[PDB]
Amino acid sequence: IPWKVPGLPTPIENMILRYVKAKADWWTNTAHYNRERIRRGATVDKTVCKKNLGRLTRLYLKAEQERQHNYLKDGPYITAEEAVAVYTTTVHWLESRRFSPIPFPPLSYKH
Amino acid sequence: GKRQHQKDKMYITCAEYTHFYGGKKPDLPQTNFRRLPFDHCSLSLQPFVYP
Amino acid sequence: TSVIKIAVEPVNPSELPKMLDGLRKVNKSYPSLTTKVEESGEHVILGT
Amino acid sequence: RRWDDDVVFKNCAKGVDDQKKDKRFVNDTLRSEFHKKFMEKYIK
C-alpha cells in the first residue's frame, strides 16, 4: 500500500525510507534461505514453515500486482499482427473440422 | 552448548553458502572430450564422401 | 624384466603437465622403471 | 516445399540471444535477478 505522509519533514522521511529498506532486505533474505532449508529438509519445525509461507505469499502478491500494473501501462504484449494470425488460424481449423458451435442451454434442455 | 540444529542454524552455514549463495564451486571438468570422428565433415558433422 | 603395467591419469585434466614433470622425476629415481605414452594418450608405468 | 511451410510464426526466439544478467546489479531486492529466479522456482 503506498505510504505517503503529507506534512512530514524530509530529513525524517529520508531516514524512515532508509530504515524500512534495510528491514525489507533482512526480511526478504530470511525468506530466501528458509525456503531453501524447507525444500532440502533441514527444518522440522512447523511454525517456521508457517512463517515462511506467510512471507512468501506477501512477496508473490507484491510481484503479481506489479505485473498487472505493467500490463495496463506497457500495453498488451500480443501485437495486432500476432493476434490476428492466431485468430485467423483458429477459424480455419474449426472451419475445416466442420465444428458446430455450442449453443446457450435452453431452459427446456433435456439433460 | 550442544550442536543440536546444525543444518538449520541462525545464519547461513558454510556449505550452504558455497552451494547456493555464491561460494566457489570446484568446477572440475571442462569439455574433457569433444572430438568429431575423423570420418566426418566438420561443417555437416556427418560422414564425408569427398574429403 | 618389468612386466607389471599400470596406467596413470591426473584428476584435473588441466593439471596434466605437473604429472609429466613428476613422471620424469620418478624415471630418474628408479633405475628399471619404464614410462611410455600410448596411442590413446594413456601414460603407462612398467615395474616389477 | 519444406516441412515448415504452413507455420504461422518465425524468428520468435531472436531476442533472448545473449544472457548477461550477472553483470547488472540492481540494489532493489524485489527487482534483483536472484529474487526473480526464486519466484520462478518456488511458486510453480
Binding site: 501485437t79 495486432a80 499482427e81 500476432e82 490476428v84 494470425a85 485467423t88 488460424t89 477459424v91 480455419h92 | 572430438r35 575423423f38 | 596411442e39 590413446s40 594418450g41 | 511451410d5 504452413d6 507455420v7 504461422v8 510464426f9 518465425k10 524468428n11 520468435c12
Partner: peptide
C-alpha cells in the same frame, strides 16, 4: 595433421500470412 589426439517491421515474425490477415492488417 588431420587428427592428433594429443593437442522491426510489423509483419516481421509472420511467415505465411493468409488472405484474411493481409486484408485485416
Amino acid at each position: 595433421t588431420l587428427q592428433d589426439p594429443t593437442n522491426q517491421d510489423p509483419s516481421y515474425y509472420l511467415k505465411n500470412t493468409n488472405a484474411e490477415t493481409r486484408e485485416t492488417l
